[PDB]
Every structure is written in structure tokens, then in C-alpha cells.
Amino acid sequence: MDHHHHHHLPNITILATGGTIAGGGDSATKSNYTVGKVGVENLVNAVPQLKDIANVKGEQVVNIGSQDMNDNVWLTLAKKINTDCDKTDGFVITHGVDTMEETAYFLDLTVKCDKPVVMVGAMRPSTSMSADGPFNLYNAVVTAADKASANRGVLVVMNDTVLDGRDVTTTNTTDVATFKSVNYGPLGYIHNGKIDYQRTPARKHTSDTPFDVSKLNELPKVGIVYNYANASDLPAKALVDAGYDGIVSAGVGNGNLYKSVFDTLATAAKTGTAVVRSSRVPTGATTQDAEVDDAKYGFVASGTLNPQKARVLLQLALTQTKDPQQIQQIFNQY
């Protein structure tokens, strides 16, 4: 019989992928830096207070700028998380900000582990005055260690805020406060190492999706084309000529397409290419029942998913189905 208890700190695994969080330059003050050149051990050791909140173990997955994120790394991450779920209490992924909102959503759809998975980055390199990385990493570990964080999907933690992987996006090129869930808001705020969660995502995620990438070595090919005045149809045609499985249109306004672009995508859809209309506009849904007769052309409306997120869901949809009506149902549920 024990006569007293002791507090046990959770085991948290850090999966490091690079990013400005791991970036460095030669001056504390100059803006120039190189990404992904500092290892995970260095990041942990720069936050000596992590020992107060978790038993941390670091693993270097890759060390890249997130501008070079790709399908291979996504599959690696999802499989590692799903395989290693039973071995830890939670995960933190250090990652670049530039495509964090894509990876987070991919993982939000493909992770099956029911322990928290928290992504984190930094807007200033590790070497800069007032670098944001250390406290962001601390708060990410706080979030991954909180029992309340489970069953909320894959999270992003930046600037004292817990954000869901589906709605989160980077809103500013340089500001440390850039990450916002611009349609539906954050889940919780962090103060003094404690989170007050007031929201959770209603769209199905993680173990409630059908997307199972455990055996996959590649993902369906999906490209993104931009719309604007006098838009060339040559980007769309190039993707069609290469046999792309899907194309997402970054439309103008509520997902509208320049006529040339429309014409190429209509034609492609008729031959079986999947075509999703999203929007270059930074907030709001690309809706059904506006100026485009989606049913007639075999197009899908992306809802609040921006083009790059729409790409993520469409690649996954394409592992299950090629039928536009079933792909629309997916875009209505995940």
C-alpha cells in the first residue's frame, strides 16, 4: 500500500520537421535567415521550463522549410503518429508556418490516435531578438499535455491560442499573431499554462473519417489554378494534359471563374477530372447555388475550405471515389 501519491508529468513526443522555429541567421537584428538548420535537441534545450510540464522526447523527421512540404512527408507523419500512438501521451510537431495550415488539415483527416497532436511554429528565427519560438513551443507542450485537448482534432498552437486544423490559416506575412481561424474562431486561449476551451470542431475528424493512409505510398495528383482578370487558361490546360486526378480553382469572389478557365475545367470534368471551386478571397464559403450550376458541370463547391485546404480534402476524397456527387458529400461532412 502506498502512503501518498506523486504527480506524474505526461510523456510528450516532439516530431521536428524544420521551419523558422528551427531557423537561424547571423544577426539578432537583421531579417535574413536560413530555415531548418537547428536540430530538435537545440529547441528543447532553449525552453528549460519544459521539464516543469512534461517529459519530452525529440525526434527529427525532416529539417525543411515548409515551403517545400510535400505528400511524402505528410504520409510519413501520419503513419508515424498512428504507429507510435500507444508509446506516448501526446505529440507536438514543429513545422514551418508557410504550409502549416495544409499539413494540419491533412493530419486532422488521417490521424487515428486519440491523443493530442499539436503543431507549432514561429515567425522569427531562433536567433532573433524577442524570438517567439520558445514560448510557442512551451505553450504547444502545455496544450498536448492537457487532458482537455483530446478529441478536438489536430491542433495548431501559436500566440497563446489553440486553433483547429481545419479552419486555421496564416493571415499575415510577418506578424507573430498571424495564425487565425478566420471563419469560426479559435478553440481556446492559454494563460499561465492553463487553457479555457469553449469550442470544438463539429466537422468530422481523425477517427471519425474514412481516410486511411496506412498503406498508401502516394496521393492523387491535385493542382491549384488562380483566377483574376484576363486569366490564362494555360495553367489549367497543363494540369489536364498531364492527367491530373483533380484540380482546385482559386476563384474570384464566391468561387467564380474567368471564362477561359471555366471552359477548360468544364471540359476536364466531363472526362472525369474532379474539379473543386474554392476562392482566393480569404474568408467565407464558396457556396453552392450562386452563379455556377455545379450540378450541370460536375463541379464541387469547397465551402469554407481555401484552395490549399480544398486540395488536401480532394486528394483524400480521390482515394475513396471519383464521383462528383460523393465528393460533394465529403466536402459537406469533413
Give catalytic residues, as residue numbers.
20
Q: Is 285 in the site for a second copy (CB under 8 A)?
A: yes
- DSSP one-letter string for 70-132: -HHHHHHHHHHHHHHGGG-SEEEEE--STTHHHHHHHHHHH----S-EEEE--SS-TTSTT-S
Point out which residues pair with 238 in neighbouring strands: none
103 binds, among a second copy, ligand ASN, none (CB under 5 to 8 A by kind): a second copy
Radius of gyration of the chain (CA): 21
Per CB under 8 A, 97 contacts a second copy: yes
**Is 293 a binder of ligand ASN (CB under 6 A)?**
no
Residues with Cβ < 8 Å from 297, sequence gap 6 or more?
265, 266, 269, 275
Q: How many CB atoms lie within 10 A of CB 173?
A: 9
Residue 311 interacts with which of a second copy, ligand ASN, none, CB < 5 to 8 Å by class: a second copy
Judged by beta carbon distances under 5 to 8 A according to partner kind, the member of ligand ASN, a second copy, none in contact with residue 273 is none
Closest-CA residue to 82 (of 112, 117, 116, 118): 112
Q: Is there binding between residue 192 and a second copy (CB under 8 A)?
A: no
Q: Indicate the residue whose CB is closest to ligand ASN.
A: 96
Other CB atoms within 10 Å distance of the CB of residue 135: 15
The answer to whether 248 and 257 have CB atoms below 8 angstroms apart is no
Query: Minimum distance between the CB of residue 231 and ligand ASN, rounded to whole angstroms?
Result: 14
Q: Which three cell numbers stand for residue 263?
A: 471552359
Nearer to a second copy, 59 or 323 (CB): 59
Which residues inside 225-284 make contact with a second copy, applying CB under 8 A? 225-232, 234-235, 237-239, 241-242, 244, 250-259, 279-284
- Choose among 54, 74, 47, 7: nearest CA to 319: 74
Nearer to ligand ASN, 125 or 303 (CB): 125
Q: Spell out the SS3 assignment of 80-93.
A: HHHHHHHHCCEEEE
DSSP state of 251: E
Q: Footprint of ligand ASN on residues 140-199 (CB under 6 A)? A: none
Question: Binding of ligand ASN at residue 19 (CB under 6 A)?
Answer: yes
Residue 160 is given by DSSP the state: T
Please, which of residues 33-52 interact with a second copy by CB under 8 A?
A: 33-35, 44-51
Site string (191-230) toward ligand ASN, x via CB under 6 A: ----------------------------------------
Pick the binder of ligand ASN from 31, 52, 200, 253 (CB under 6 A).
Answer: 253
Residue 251 in the binding site for ligand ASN (CB under 6 A): no
Q: How far apart are CA 334 and CA 330, in angstroms?
A: 6
Min. distance of Cβ 259 from ligand ASN in angstroms? 12
Which residue among 16, 35, 140, 276 contacts ligand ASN (CB under 6 A)? 35
Residues that bind ligand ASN (CB under 6 A): 18-20, 35, 65-67, 96-98, 121, 123, 253, 256, 291
